[PDB]
Amino acid sequence: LWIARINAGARLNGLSYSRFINGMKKANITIDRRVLADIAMHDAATFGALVEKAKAEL
Amino acid sequence: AIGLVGKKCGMTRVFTEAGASIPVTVVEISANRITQVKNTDVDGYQAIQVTTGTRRDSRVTAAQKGHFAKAGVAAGRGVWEFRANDSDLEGREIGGEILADLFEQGQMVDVTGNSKGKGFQGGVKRHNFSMQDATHGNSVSHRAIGSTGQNQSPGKVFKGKKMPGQMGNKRVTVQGLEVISVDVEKGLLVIKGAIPGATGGDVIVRPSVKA
Amino acid sequence: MKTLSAKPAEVTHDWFVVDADGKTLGRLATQIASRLRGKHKTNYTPHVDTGDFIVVINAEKIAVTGKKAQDKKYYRHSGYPGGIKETNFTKLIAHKPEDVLHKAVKGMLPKGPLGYAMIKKLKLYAGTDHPHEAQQPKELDI
Amino acid sequence: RVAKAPVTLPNGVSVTLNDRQVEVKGKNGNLSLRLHDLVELKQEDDVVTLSPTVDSKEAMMHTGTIRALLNNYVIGVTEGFERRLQLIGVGYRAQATGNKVTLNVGYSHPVEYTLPEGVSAETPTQTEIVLKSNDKQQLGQAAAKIRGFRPPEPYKGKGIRYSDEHVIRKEAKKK
Amino acid sequence: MKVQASVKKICGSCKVVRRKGRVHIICTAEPRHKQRQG
RNA sequence: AACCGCUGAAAGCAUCUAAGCGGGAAGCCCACCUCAAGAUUAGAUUUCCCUAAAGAGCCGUUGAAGACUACGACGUUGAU
RNA sequence: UCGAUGUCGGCUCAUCUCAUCCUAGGGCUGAAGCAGGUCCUAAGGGUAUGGCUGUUCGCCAUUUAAAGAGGUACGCGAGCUGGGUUUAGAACGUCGUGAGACAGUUCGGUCCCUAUCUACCGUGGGCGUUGGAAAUUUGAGAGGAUCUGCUCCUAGUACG
């Protein structure tokens, strides 16, 4: 469920889930998929900034 | 492609001068009053609605009384629709008239009616099943259905298997029947053949579709 | 903190119009199936219908590649012994144009009450017009 | 080879290309062919060179057939095509009356054939049909259709046959 | 004609022609040389 | 479908085929008969009615309708 | 599968396959015609009655356009039969000293079940179908049906 929500959120602004997780790993962001899906569902601006970090890292 | 509704009056014969007897059936044709003309714009298809016969006022609902009043006709015993085309919707106006003139002598017609009802019937009469042995040790299965399937494969009865059930009392059409004589002042339609149903039943006579 | 579901009363289904003109049958069908399920939304929960209404026009103009227009077979059994019937993609496009895309999407949706409820949001029409200007669908090139 | 051969345009004839549809207009009439989407058509001084859009076997095989069809259209508009059918048989005869030709060959009934729009038949004698057309395709189709009512038989040669058609002959009552 | 798995030109007037992805031998000299693969 | 083509290149020829255009079976899809909107996508049209209405049902007399049902007819303004 | 899955044949009732028996369309032919022979397509229909034997089969008689090959628990006994096989009686031949035995034969010899579920054939009740009602209807679909002889005529012509 969390992975599906994060995939929806990342595709909403930018890249796919796989590239997003790679970008987080490169950015050294330790946030787990549970919190990530919670932010995707409940805080679209914060998830946008979080996606921008992963996108800047690749 | 439009027909008329009549009542089966019974069977008789017509003799020809050569001395051939023609089995005929007599149809009373009351006036077929036109109650509604259906067109493609309003209904999506073309049809003529007619009524024939009578009902007393106490037996006609307010909805049907208004339906008949809109046409300007008297309530009939039923209401019947005939699918038509632009050629058929020529002189046919609401409240108009359809008589036995619709058919000519020697014209082939299709006649539809409710068949005589035989009620619950076994396979022997309903489907021409063979009887099993009357003697020769036959137990209590003389008019039995016999086997109703195969073994484990398929392990069921196939749909549409012939069995006992209600026989007759269904809509049935007989095609290729000849108009022996038309009379319109008396509302007489004499047709060669059998005409499904009993005397007093509702019959529909249309031009023959085989042609 | 917990993981919340979408709360059907709080969900809104948006209306979109898709032109299936010359598009590949299955390539469009997958996109439509995802939209009907609601997988593009961050509130996606597999037990709630979070999808969107998809209105497909030019459904008779959808395309298949190869020799599939004449070799793609549609079988059905009528329930009667020997009652197996087959039709072509081209014959089915001539006869019931919407059924090609409806069949493709029904194959890709989950098979159960919720899937039946999500296929009910697919409004697909042969021709350039749909009777849903009241819903104001937004053009969606997918 | 066929594709690389240019199509020489006589003085009367002319070709125009409007939205992938080549029209050849001249003294006999007007013909038209749909230009394949893998072939390009360019005109020079009284000649038409048509070449593949890309250097490929498929494009060359399509420009060969476009060239052949265009050349046939040009010749069929500058002078037309003509085909001859012969009838062999005791009571075999043909009569051309307008666009409809009747044949009494061997049936309990004469056969009536309506020529396609673009083919004209005349019967100088009663056992010989002359067909004339602008396009070789429609001429050949009409000839085949007429000839197919009674194709030639090997044992006596009876039937409708093409002029200068080799009919195989077999011997009846062999040992 | 002869419908068989091995279709080969017989005389020298036979042609190998393939139509609809299927191999035929068509002969202009001997009508019983006509073959189709299958 | 098999099969027979027309024109036609790949493959200067030939060639039913690759582009294109034809013929062709009791077979396929319609057409014929019956059923059919629980086709839950439950469709259409005409009328009628809404402070118990329009109607439907019970009940009764009943029918070439019928196992029971249902269905058809009629109940004094009446030939059931 | 042995705390039981009844055997052969017949009857009744079928359903499917196609490697097609007839009917339909064809190519080749040592195809003149009429008839065929082969192979390709084709499963829509249709596809005997009797004599013998328990027979399936098989032979035979007479037909038919044809008398197809198969699968379906060698379909079908909680649908029927019970002639054979395969209990107990008895006998013959044969084997055994014998009790007995024999894919040897012969005469005789109990076939149960009121149907819960699935299926199927019919026929109702309920609810729904965006207020209710009486009628008339479109048709997404489904089922049924689909066989074929002979005579005349073309014409005693084409062919020979």
GROMACS .gro file of N, CA and C (backbone and C1' of nucleotides) in nm, chain B residues 36 42-43 55-56 59 61-63 66-67 70 112 116-120 166-167 169 171 173 175 198-199 209-210, chain F residues 31-35 44-49 54-56 64-67 69-70 73-80:
model
  280
   94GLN      N    1  -5.286   0.443  -3.230
   94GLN     CA    2  -5.162   0.518  -3.223
   94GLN      C    3  -5.076   0.483  -3.344
  100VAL      N    4  -4.032   0.980  -3.276
  100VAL     CA    5  -4.081   0.974  -3.139
  100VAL      C    6  -4.047   0.840  -3.073
  101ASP      N    7  -4.060   0.730  -3.146
  101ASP     CA    8  -4.045   0.597  -3.088
  101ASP      C    9  -3.921   0.523  -3.135
  113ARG      N   10  -6.486  -0.337  -2.487
  113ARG     CA   11  -6.497  -0.359  -2.344
  113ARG      C   12  -6.602  -0.265  -2.289
  114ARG      N   13  -6.669  -0.308  -2.183
  114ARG     CA   14  -6.754  -0.218  -2.108
  114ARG      C   15  -6.669  -0.113  -2.038
  117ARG      N   16  -6.468  -0.182  -1.721
  117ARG     CA   17  -6.356  -0.274  -1.738
  117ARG      C   18  -6.238  -0.208  -1.808
  119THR      N   19  -5.951   0.088  -1.779
  119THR     CA   20  -5.887   0.173  -1.680
  119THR      C   21  -5.887   0.318  -1.728
  120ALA      N   22  -5.865   0.409  -1.633
  120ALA     CA   23  -5.857   0.551  -1.666
  120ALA      C   24  -5.744   0.580  -1.764
  121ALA      N   25  -5.630   0.512  -1.747
  121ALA     CA   26  -5.519   0.530  -1.840
  121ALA      C   27  -5.557   0.486  -1.981
  124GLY      N   28  -5.815   0.727  -2.138
  124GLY     CA   29  -5.747   0.841  -2.199
  124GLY      C   30  -5.670   0.806  -2.325
  125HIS      N   31  -5.608   0.689  -2.330
  125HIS     CA   32  -5.538   0.645  -2.450
  125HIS      C   33  -5.633   0.633  -2.568
  128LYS      N   34  -5.769   0.987  -2.678
  128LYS     CA   35  -5.675   1.065  -2.758
  128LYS      C   36  -5.685   1.029  -2.906
  170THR      N   37  -5.105  -1.583  -3.680
  170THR     CA   38  -5.049  -1.606  -3.548
  170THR      C   39  -5.161  -1.621  -3.447
  174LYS      N   40  -5.370  -2.419  -2.861
  174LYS     CA   41  -5.445  -2.486  -2.757
  174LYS      C   42  -5.350  -2.536  -2.650
  175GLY      N   43  -5.391  -2.522  -2.524
  175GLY     CA   44  -5.306  -2.558  -2.413
  175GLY      C   45  -5.330  -2.699  -2.367
  176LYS      N   46  -5.224  -2.778  -2.361
  176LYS     CA   47  -5.233  -2.916  -2.316
  176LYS      C   48  -5.188  -2.934  -2.173
  177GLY      N   49  -5.149  -2.827  -2.105
  177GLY     CA   50  -5.097  -2.831  -1.971
  177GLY      C   51  -4.965  -2.906  -1.963
  178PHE      N   52  -4.940  -2.962  -1.846
  178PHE     CA   53  -4.823  -3.045  -1.822
  178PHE      C   54  -4.829  -3.171  -1.908
  224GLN      N   55  -4.495  -2.768  -1.958
  224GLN     CA   56  -4.614  -2.709  -2.016
  224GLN      C   57  -4.611  -2.718  -2.168
  225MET      N   58  -4.719  -2.768  -2.227
  225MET     CA   59  -4.730  -2.787  -2.370
  225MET      C   60  -4.845  -2.704  -2.425
  227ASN      N   61  -5.046  -2.353  -2.555
  227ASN     CA   62  -5.079  -2.223  -2.495
  227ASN      C   63  -4.970  -2.120  -2.523
  229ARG      N   64  -4.763  -1.864  -2.830
  229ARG     CA   65  -4.768  -1.798  -2.960
  229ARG      C   66  -4.710  -1.889  -3.068
  231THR      N   67  -4.709  -1.931  -3.515
  231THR     CA   68  -4.736  -1.874  -3.646
  231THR      C   69  -4.740  -1.985  -3.750
  233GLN      N   70  -4.739  -2.009  -4.161
  233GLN     CA   71  -4.710  -1.934  -4.281
  233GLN      C   72  -4.770  -2.000  -4.405
  256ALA      N   73  -5.811  -2.212  -3.050
  256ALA     CA   74  -5.948  -2.259  -3.046
  256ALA      C   75  -6.041  -2.152  -3.103
  257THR      N   76  -6.166  -2.192  -3.128
  257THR     CA   77  -6.264  -2.095  -3.174
  257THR      C   78  -6.289  -1.993  -3.064
  267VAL      N   79  -4.461  -1.336  -4.503
  267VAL     CA   80  -4.325  -1.284  -4.510
  267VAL      C   81  -4.239  -1.365  -4.606
  268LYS      N   82  -4.280  -1.488  -4.638
  268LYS     CA   83  -4.202  -1.567  -4.733
  268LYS      C   84  -4.205  -1.503  -4.871
  655A        P   85  -3.197  -1.133  -3.815
  655A      O5'   86  -3.286  -1.162  -3.944
  655A      C5'   87  -3.310  -1.061  -4.040
  655A      C4'   88  -3.338  -1.119  -4.177
  655A      C3'   89  -3.450  -1.221  -4.186
  655A      O3'   90  -3.578  -1.161  -4.187
  655A      C1'   91  -3.263  -1.297  -4.309
  656C        P   92  -3.683  -1.190  -4.070
  656C      O5'   93  -3.729  -1.341  -4.093
  656C      C5'   94  -3.822  -1.376  -4.194
  656C      C4'   95  -3.867  -1.518  -4.176
  656C      C3'   96  -3.918  -1.552  -4.037
  656C      O3'   97  -4.055  -1.520  -4.021
  656C      C1'   98  -3.758  -1.713  -4.105
  657C        P   99  -4.107  -1.443  -3.891
  657C      O5'  100  -4.136  -1.559  -3.786
  657C      C5'  101  -4.220  -1.668  -3.818
  657C      C4'  102  -4.201  -1.780  -3.719
  657C      C3'  103  -4.196  -1.738  -3.573
  657C      O3'  104  -4.325  -1.722  -3.517
  657C      C1'  105  -4.017  -1.884  -3.619
  658U        P  106  -4.352  -1.610  -3.408
  658U      O5'  107  -4.289  -1.668  -3.274
  658U      C5'  108  -4.343  -1.782  -3.211
  658U      C4'  109  -4.252  -1.833  -3.103
  658U      C3'  110  -4.214  -1.733  -2.995
  658U      O3'  111  -4.315  -1.714  -2.898
  658U      C1'  112  -4.021  -1.846  -3.068
  659C        P  113  -4.328  -1.573  -2.824
  659C      O5'  114  -4.207  -1.571  -2.722
  659C      C5'  115  -4.193  -1.672  -2.625
  659C      C4'  116  -4.059  -1.664  -2.558
  659C      C3'  117  -4.017  -1.528  -2.506
  659C      O3'  118  -4.080  -1.491  -2.385
  659C      C1'  119  -3.837  -1.624  -2.621
  668A        P  120  -3.624   0.502  -2.094
  668A      O5'  121  -3.703   0.513  -2.231
  668A      C5'  122  -3.640   0.561  -2.349
  668A      C4'  123  -3.721   0.526  -2.471
  668A      C3'  124  -3.863   0.579  -2.474
  668A      O3'  125  -3.870   0.711  -2.522
  668A      C1'  126  -3.864   0.349  -2.526
  669U        P  127  -3.956   0.823  -2.446
  669U      O5'  128  -4.100   0.811  -2.511
  669U      C5'  129  -4.117   0.808  -2.652
  669U      C4'  130  -4.246   0.740  -2.689
  669U      C3'  131  -4.370   0.792  -2.621
  669U      O3'  132  -4.419   0.910  -2.680
  669U      C1'  133  -4.371   0.556  -2.620
  670U        P  134  -4.496   1.019  -2.591
  670U      O5'  135  -4.642   0.959  -2.577
  670U      C5'  136  -4.714   0.914  -2.691
  670U      C4'  137  -4.845   0.852  -2.650
  670U      C3'  138  -4.912   0.918  -2.531
  670U      O3'  139  -4.982   1.035  -2.568
  670U      C1'  140  -4.914   0.683  -2.504
  671U        P  141  -5.046   1.129  -2.456
  671U      O5'  142  -5.184   1.058  -2.425
  671U      C5'  143  -5.259   1.091  -2.310
  671U      C4'  144  -5.316   0.970  -2.244
  671U      C3'  145  -5.340   0.985  -2.096
  671U      O3'  146  -5.460   1.054  -2.069
  671U      C1'  147  -5.231   0.780  -2.136
  672C        P  148  -5.460   1.176  -1.966
  672C      O5'  149  -5.496   1.105  -1.828
  672C      C5'  150  -5.586   0.995  -1.826
  672C      C4'  151  -5.569   0.915  -1.700
  672C      C3'  152  -5.529   0.994  -1.578
  672C      O3'  153  -5.636   1.065  -1.520
  672C      C1'  154  -5.399   0.798  -1.591
  673C        P  155  -5.609   1.206  -1.448
  673C      O5'  156  -5.561   1.164  -1.303
  673C      C5'  157  -5.627   1.060  -1.233
  673C      C4'  158  -5.547   1.014  -1.115
  673C      C3'  159  -5.490   1.123  -1.029
  673C      O3'  160  -5.587   1.175  -0.941
  673C      C1'  161  -5.325   0.958  -1.068
  678A        P  162  -5.954   0.627  -0.794
  678A      O5'  163  -5.863   0.606  -0.922
  678A      C5'  164  -5.829   0.715  -1.006
  678A      C4'  165  -5.710   0.680  -1.090
  678A      C3'  166  -5.701   0.534  -1.129
  678A      O3'  167  -5.780   0.503  -1.242
  678A      C1'  168  -5.493   0.605  -1.043
  679G        P  169  -5.844   0.358  -1.259
  679G      O5'  170  -5.720   0.266  -1.297
  679G      C5'  171  -5.715   0.130  -1.258
  679G      C4'  172  -5.584   0.097  -1.192
  679G      C3'  173  -5.574  -0.042  -1.133
  679G      O3'  174  -5.539  -0.137  -1.231
  679G      C1'  175  -5.497   0.117  -0.976
  680A        P  176  -5.617  -0.276  -1.242
  680A      O5'  177  -5.538  -0.372  -1.142
  680A      C5'  178  -5.397  -0.371  -1.137
  680A      C4'  179  -5.347  -0.419  -1.004
  680A      C3'  180  -5.420  -0.539  -0.946
  680A      O3'  181  -5.378  -0.662  -1.003
  680A      C1'  182  -5.393  -0.376  -0.778
  688A        P  183  -6.331  -2.523  -2.050
  688A      O5'  184  -6.269  -2.538  -2.195
  688A      C5'  185  -6.182  -2.439  -2.248
  688A      C4'  186  -6.067  -2.504  -2.318
  688A      C3'  187  -5.960  -2.412  -2.375
  688A      O3'  188  -5.835  -2.478  -2.357
  688A      C1'  189  -6.050  -2.547  -2.547
  689A        P  190  -5.693  -2.408  -2.377
  689A      O5'  191  -5.693  -2.279  -2.285
  689A      C5'  192  -5.578  -2.195  -2.281
  689A      C4'  193  -5.529  -2.168  -2.141
  689A      C3'  194  -5.493  -2.288  -2.054
  689A      O3'  195  -5.365  -2.341  -2.081
  689A      C1'  196  -5.628  -2.141  -1.930
  690G        P  197  -5.333  -2.496  -2.056
  690G      O5'  198  -5.317  -2.513  -1.899
  690G      C5'  199  -5.222  -2.440  -1.823
  690G      C4'  200  -5.252  -2.452  -1.676
  690G      C3'  201  -5.254  -2.594  -1.622
  690G      O3'  202  -5.126  -2.643  -1.590
  690G      C1'  203  -5.450  -2.483  -1.555
  691A        P  204  -5.103  -2.796  -1.552
  691A      O5'  205  -5.172  -2.811  -1.410
  691A      C5'  206  -5.267  -2.913  -1.383
  691A      C4'  207  -5.256  -2.958  -1.240
  691A      C3'  208  -5.276  -2.849  -1.135
  691A      O3'  209  -5.413  -2.822  -1.109
  691A      C1'  210  -5.083  -2.975  -1.083
  693U        P  211  -5.499  -2.270  -0.711
  693U      O5'  212  -5.380  -2.166  -0.698
  693U      C5'  213  -5.354  -2.071  -0.800
  693U      C4'  214  -5.207  -2.040  -0.807
  693U      C3'  215  -5.170  -1.919  -0.892
  693U      O3'  216  -5.185  -1.797  -0.823
  693U      C1'  217  -5.028  -2.101  -0.947
  694A        P  218  -5.273  -1.678  -0.885
  694A      O5'  219  -5.203  -1.644  -1.023
  694A      C5'  220  -5.071  -1.591  -1.028
  694A      C4'  221  -5.006  -1.623  -1.159
  694A      C3'  222  -5.073  -1.564  -1.281
  694A      O3'  223  -5.035  -1.430  -1.304
  694A      C1'  224  -5.032  -1.791  -1.320
  697A        P  225  -5.915  -1.029  -1.997
  697A      O5'  226  -6.064  -1.085  -1.984
  697A      C5'  227  -6.136  -1.125  -2.099
  697A      C4'  228  -6.267  -1.192  -2.063
  697A      C3'  229  -6.355  -1.121  -1.963
  697A      O3'  230  -6.422  -1.008  -2.016
  697A      C1'  231  -6.350  -1.349  -1.912
  698C        P  232  -6.425  -0.873  -1.932
  698C      O5'  233  -6.549  -0.891  -1.834
  698C      C5'  234  -6.676  -0.925  -1.885
  698C      C4'  235  -6.757  -1.006  -1.788
  698C      C3'  236  -6.792  -0.939  -1.657
  698C      O3'  237  -6.898  -0.845  -1.667
  698C      C1'  238  -6.719  -1.158  -1.615
  699G        P  239  -6.906  -0.722  -1.565
  699G      O5'  240  -6.950  -0.788  -1.427
  699G      C5'  241  -7.082  -0.833  -1.405
  699G      C4'  242  -7.101  -0.875  -1.262
  699G      C3'  243  -7.083  -0.767  -1.158
  699G      O3'  244  -7.200  -0.690  -1.141
  699G      C1'  245  -6.970  -0.965  -1.092
  700U        P  246  -7.192  -0.531  -1.124
  700U      O5'  247  -7.335  -0.482  -1.172
  700U      C5'  248  -7.382  -0.509  -1.304
  700U      C4'  249  -7.532  -0.520  -1.308
  700U      C3'  250  -7.606  -0.431  -1.208
  700U      O3'  251  -7.728  -0.385  -1.265
  700U      C1'  252  -7.661  -0.658  -1.170
  701U        P  253  -7.773  -0.232  -1.242
  701U      O5'  254  -7.703  -0.153  -1.361
  701U      C5'  255  -7.753  -0.162  -1.494
  701U      C4'  256  -7.647  -0.128  -1.596
  701U      C3'  257  -7.534  -0.229  -1.610
  701U      O3'  258  -7.493  -0.236  -1.746
  701U      C1'  259  -7.445  -0.018  -1.552
  702G        P  260  -7.522  -0.368  -1.832
  702G      O5'  261  -7.482  -0.487  -1.734
  702G      C5'  262  -7.346  -0.519  -1.708
  702G      C4'  263  -7.328  -0.667  -1.688
  702G      C3'  264  -7.389  -0.755  -1.794
  702G      O3'  265  -7.309  -0.766  -1.910
  702G      C1'  266  -7.447  -0.838  -1.582
  703A        P  267  -7.373  -0.815  -2.047
  703A      O5'  268  -7.298  -0.952  -2.076
  703A      C5'  269  -7.366  -1.061  -2.136
  703A      C4'  270  -7.326  -1.192  -2.072
  703A      C3'  271  -7.299  -1.305  -2.170
  703A      O3'  272  -7.209  -1.398  -2.111
  703A      C1'  273  -7.493  -1.355  -2.043
  704U        P  274  -7.049  -1.376  -2.115
  704U      O5'  275  -7.001  -1.433  -1.976
  704U      C5'  276  -6.864  -1.457  -1.947
  704U      C4'  277  -6.850  -1.532  -1.818
  704U      C3'  278  -6.932  -1.660  -1.808
  704U      O3'  279  -6.871  -1.770  -1.871
  704U      C1'  280  -6.963  -1.532  -1.613
   0.00000   0.00000   0.00000
